[PDB]
Design a protein around this ligand. Structure first.
Ligand SMILES: CCCCCCCCCCCCCCCCCC(=O)OC[C@H](CO[C@@H]1O[C@H](CO[C@H]2O[C@H](CO)[C@H](O)[C@H](O)[C@H]2O)[C@H](O)[C@H](O)[C@H]1O)OC(=O)CCCCCCCCCCCCCCCCC
Ligand code: CLA
Ligand code: CLA
Ligand code: CLA
Ligand code: CLA
Ligand code: CLA
Ligand code: CLA
Ligand SMILES: CCCCCCCCCCCCCCCCCC(=O)OC[C@H](CO[C@@H]1O[C@H](CO)[C@H](O)[C@H](O)[C@H]1O)OC(=O)CCCCCCCCCCCCCCCCC
Ligand SMILES: CCCCCCCCCCCCCCCCCC(=O)OC[C@H](CO[C@@H]1O[C@H](CO)[C@H](O)[C@H](O)[C@H]1O)OC(=O)CCCCCCCCCCCCCCCCC
Ligand SMILES: CC1=C(/C=C/C(C)=C/C=C/C(C)=C\C=C\C=C(C)\C=C\C=C(C)\C=C\C2=C(C)CCCC2(C)C)C(C)(C)CCC1
Ligand code: SF4
Ligand code: SF4
Lengths: 64, 80, 144, 98, 164, 41
């Protein structure tokens, strides 16, 4: 089926080395292929490089 | 000889290769991304470690990564 | 089709009256790196060792003492002027080594046949702790 | 006459609309803050007129009217010292016994 | 006389230093006519000075070996001996105003996050909103301790960490 | 002049109005209350 959350849901990042750990953002798209890190999340909190988006895996990512 | 090791969080946007002022980095096929490419460092003998690669990686907690090792006459950037 | 071009030193230099920022005694002992390109028209580029040299039509041969001094020359020869250079590495025993388009294609674009060295099939946040890599002969990063 | 007066009539509308949007001079600043480095880069890049635009005419008009701003502040500064020389001083008494 | 001290109305180096200052003002006063504003100013300085010594002795401030008003910052030695106005009254007169500025600035930040882009309204302060929270925050300890009882003051472990 | 009142509502302009408010309030109090070292009645 369509793995990952829906197209524009809110989400919580659980990657402990990411800059947005324990922090809430919006999924923008989930790539439906054998990519290791499909889930693309956009934030309002920009990082130290000014990059507001990142790819995450299916398991580092929890709803609400 | 500096230690440059990159990781699977690469997305293959090849901004590290274009930013490398010493041709340390090049782009190898790899299926774990949409752009079908992942970097590689076959020329870490020539690296100075100026870290222009990881100023340019977009991914959070940078995919390319430079470890400052033991410095030869090419790593210290010497014309002499 | 492409493989490993050689060099003749017969090819003319750019017209440059010489700077004090050029080679040093390292060129006579360790190594010095020569750079070639094919210019369409006569125009004026900047030397990475300070100043300005004019390129002439056909091949152009120039020599430096660092690798960044050659690649910071091709960076303004490829982006500004859309030329295709390549620089080599000359040792004082006459040996020469081909460096920058090392498989023909420039390293920003995939060649599909170059080998992926120095990679980790794991995430940077999944390194081991330094207590595990302690007493590894020499001092050693946990990313190995 | 190669040496001649040459101006342009009304290049910029006199309007407070751009005072509402700080960082309007630069592309990198006009999208608002997300970081306290925005408000330091606002004051750092403020008079870097060569970095706002590429047009040398637009740079030149900016440094020509900014010089009236520096001269206009010097004329306030001089007029302060004559005023503080007038109403709060002893210049009347100083001339008799200097 | 609490900790080797003495009342400033009772010590003499205090009164000696008062007479030291008024001596310096009067020998400065002597250079001017009695109508002149450089002498009107100095006699107004003295009447601010002499009332200042009268008011410090009125409050029962403690002098010591140097004849200066020493403060007692301990309740139980200020409540017992009548000196809560030195420290113990302004330690709550401050902490009313301090947490007031904290609470108004808190409520302005909480009530700006539910917007389009809240970073714009930290440059451009919503003055009809900010003054509205400024006036109505005057009972902030009455509002904070009610927020303290819920669990809405402290955000939970949604907070950001590195490697616990 | 709505855009002009946005400028009056920026961060440094409200800072330089409110600091003239708060200093100017404490200046007038320290005029009409000369030298308050201790809280009297
Ligand atoms: C080492 C790290 C440790 C941390 C250290 C931290 C520091 C710890 C040490 C703390 C030291 C701080 C001491 C606090 C200063 C106390 C000031 C005080 O409270 O000060 C009290 C003053 C009272 O002022 C006194 O007021 C007197 C006035 O008396 C009045 O007396 C009558 C009133 O009873 C009259 O009606 C009339 O008002 C007037 O004569 C004189 O002016 C005195 O000079 C002055 O001391 O507060 C007034 O102004 C009150 C009136 C305000 C009215 C204004 C409201 C209207 C404007 C809005
Ligand atoms: C943190 C250190 C510290 C501390 C504790 C003090 C403490 C004090 N200083 Mg000092 N000072 C300091 C640092 C400090 N200072 C520094 C760093 C400097 C150098 C800049 C000075 C320079 C200085 C000078 C030059 C003087 C003092 C004075 C004073 C006294 C304050 C008198 C006063 O203004 O009462 C203020 C009284 C109030 C009642 C203020 C309360 C505010 C309002 C009224 C309450 C709100 C009411 C209402 C609800 C609001 C209305 C708004 C409306 C919209 C509703 C007090 C002992 C003065 C003094 O007398 O010395 C002893 C004095 O002359 N200080
Ligand atoms: C004719 C005088 C003049 C003029 C027109 C300029 C013009 C310029 N300079 Mg320049 N400069 C000057 C003299 C001048 N400079 C002098 C005398 C020095 C040596 C000190 C420099 C050193 C200098 C450097 C190092 C740089 C510039 C830069 C710039 C550009 C942008 C400046 C800007 O936006 O800052 C806006 C204004 C400020 C941020 C204010 C700075 C705050 C100052 C440092 C605090 C001091 C104020 C006061 C003296 C202290 C008391 C205040 C009180 C409240 C405590 C602009 C082209 C910059 C540039 O081109 O970037 C690429 C840059 O990096 N200049
Ligand atoms: C000598 C003092 C001086 C002068 C003449 C100027 C002049 C100018 N500044 Mg400037 N500025 C100064 C000091 C000064 N600045 C300082 C100390 C800072 C803090 C570092 C800034 C920060 C600053 C910013 C952030 C901006 C300007 C802008 C401007 C321009 C707008 C003119 C304007 O609106 O005037 C009319 C104002 C009046 C009060 C009318 C006078 C009656 C003008 C060139 C703006 C600009 O160039 O944008 C393109 C802008 O965005 N300034
Ligand atoms: C270089 C500019 C300059 C500077 C630094 C000063 C500085 C000063 N002026 Mg001055 N002044 C100036 C220009 C200047 N003036 C000009 C051009 C005029 C004519 C319009 C005046 C008219 C003027 C008057 C009428 C008075 C001062 C006063 C003062 C003093 C206190 C200001 C104050 O409390 O503001 C208050 C701040 C706000 C209202 C905000 C201060 C030393 C006062 C003074 O020294 O009293 C003895 C005073 O009475 N000034
Ligand atoms: C570091 C803390 C500290 C220390 C060393 C002291 C020290 C002292 N207190 Mg004390 N006190 C403190 C904090 C402290 N107090 C606080 C926070 C309070 C609550 C407001 C009190 C309330 C208090 C009372 C009510 C009394 C003392 C008394 C005493 C004295 C016995 C001694 C000087 C007593 C005293 O005067 O001596 C018997 C006394 O009656 N204190
Ligand atoms: C925003 C703060 C503030 C507040 C609450 C007051 C409050 C007061 N001022 Mg004041 N004043 C202020 C700022 C303030 N002033 C500023 C910034 C200036 C310019 C430097 C003045 C200049 C000023 C003068 C010249 C006079 C007052 C006077 C007064 C009093 C009656 C009006 C009152 C106590 C008048 C007074 O003493 O009472 C009648 C008076 O003559 N003030
Ligand atoms: C300096 C003062 C000189 C007069 C300022 C007039 C500027 C001309 C102008 O653009 O006005 C024209 C503007 C209106 O002008 C209209 O403005 C709109 C939004 O700004 C749009 O930009 C329109 O294009 C513009 O025509 O008039 C005003 O807004 C005047 C402002 C009133 C300022 C009064 C100062 C009060 C004292 C406060 C000081 C603290
Ligand atoms: C200069 C004169 C100094 C005094 C005026 C400063 C305030 C004026 C101002 O910022 O611009 C005028 C401000 C701007 O008001 C609004 O601000 C918004 C901010 O996003 C936008 O700018 C709106 O366009 C503008 O209308 O108008 C006010 O809201 C004034 C409020 C009334 C003032 C009394 C409130 C009670 C004060 C609390 C004291 C405790
Ligand atoms: C009596 C006195 C004293 C003593 C004191 C003491 C001893 C104290 C203790 C204290 C303590 C032991 C404390 C603790 C604390 C804790 C905590 C934890 C806190 C917290 C706080 C908070 C949390 C707040 C918050 C807020 C709000 C809510 C409002 C405002 C703003 C803000 C946000 C900040 C002395 C002599 C010195 C002086 C005088 C007075
Ligand atoms: S790191 Fe950033 S730049 Fe280097 S390859 Fe991976 S993605 Fe492209
Ligand atoms: S380390 Fe310095 S040289 Fe080696 S790649 Fe990164 S940037 Fe280029």
């Amino acid at each position: 089926k369509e793995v990952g959350p829906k197209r524009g849901s809110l989400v919580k990042i659980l990657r402990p080395e990411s800059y947005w750990f324990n922090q809430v953002g919006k999924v923008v798209s989930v790539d439906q292929s054998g990519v290791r890190y499909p889930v693309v999340v956009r934030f309002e909190n920009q990082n130290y490089a000014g990059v507001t988006t990142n790819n995450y895996a299916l398991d580092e990512v929890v709803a609400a | 000889a500096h230690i440059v090791k990159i990781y699977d969080t690469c997305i293959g946007c090849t901004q590290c290769v274009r930013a490398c002022p010493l041709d340390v980095l090049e782009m190898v096929p790899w299926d774990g991304c949409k752009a079908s490419q992942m970097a590689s460092a076959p020329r870490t003998e020539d690296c100075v470690g100026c870290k222009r690669c990881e100023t340019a990686c977009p991914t959070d907690f940078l995919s390319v990564r430079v470890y400052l090792g033991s410095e030869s006459t090419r790593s210290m950037g010497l014309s002499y | 089709a492409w493989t490993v071009p050689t060099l003749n030193p017969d090819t003319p230099s750019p017209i440059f009256g010489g700077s004090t920022g050029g080679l040093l005694r390292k060129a006579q002992t360790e190594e010095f790196y020569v750079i070639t390109w094919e210019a369409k028209k006569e125009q004026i580029f900047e030397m990475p060792t300070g100043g300005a040299a004019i390129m002439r039509q056909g091949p152009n041969l120039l020599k430096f003492g660092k690798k960044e001094q050659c690649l910071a020359l091709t960076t303004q020869l490829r982006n500004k002027f859309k030329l295709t250079p390549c620089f080599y590495r000359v040792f004082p025993d006459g040996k020469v080594q081909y460096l920058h388009p090392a498989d023909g294609v420039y390293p920003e674009k995939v060649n599909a046949g170059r080998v992926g060295a120095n990679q980790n099939m794991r995430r940077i946040g999944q390194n081991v702790n330094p207590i595990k890599v302690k007493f590894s002969g020499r001092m050693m990063s946990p990313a190995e | 006459k190669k040496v001649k007066i040459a101006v342009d009539r009304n290049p910029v509308e006199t309007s407070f609309e751009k005072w509402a949007k700080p960082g309007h001079f630069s592309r990198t600043l006009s999208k608002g803050p997300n970081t306290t480095t925005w408000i330091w880069n606002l004051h750092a890049d403020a008079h870097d007129f060569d970095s706002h635009t590429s047009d040398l005419e637009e740079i030149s008009r900016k440094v020509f009217s900014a010089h009236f701003g520096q001269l206009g502040i010097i004329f306030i500064w001089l007029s302060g010292m004559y005023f503080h020389g007038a109403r709060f001083s002893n210049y009347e008494a100083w001339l008799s016994d200097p | 006389d609490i900790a080797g001290l003495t009342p400033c109305s009772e010590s003499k180096a205090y009164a000696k230093l008062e007479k030291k200052e008024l001596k310096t003002l009067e020998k400065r006063l002597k250079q001017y006519e009695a109508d002149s504003a450089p002498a009107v100013a100095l006699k107004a300085t003295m009447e601010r000075t002499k009332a200042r010594f009268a008011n410090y002795a009125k409050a029962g401030l403690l002098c010591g070996n140097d004849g200066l008003p020493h403060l007692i910052a301990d309740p139980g030695l200020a409540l017992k001996y009548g000196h809560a106005g030195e420290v113990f009254i302004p330690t709550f007169g401050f902490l009313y105003v301090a947490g007031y500025i904290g609470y108004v600035g808190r409520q302005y930040l909480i009530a700006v996050k539910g917007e389009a882009k809240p970073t714009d309204k930290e440059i451009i302060i919503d003055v009809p909103l900010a003054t509205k929270l400024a006036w109505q925050g005057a009972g902030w300890p009455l509002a904070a301790v009610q927020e303290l009882q819920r669990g809405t003051l402290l955000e939970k472990e949604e907070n950001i960490t590195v490697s616990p | 002049m709505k855009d002009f009142t946005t400028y009056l509502s920026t961060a440094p302009v409200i800072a330089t109005i409110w600091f003239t408010f708060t200093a100017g309030l404490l200046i007038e109090i320290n005029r009409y209350f000369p030298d308050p070292l201790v809280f009297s009645f």
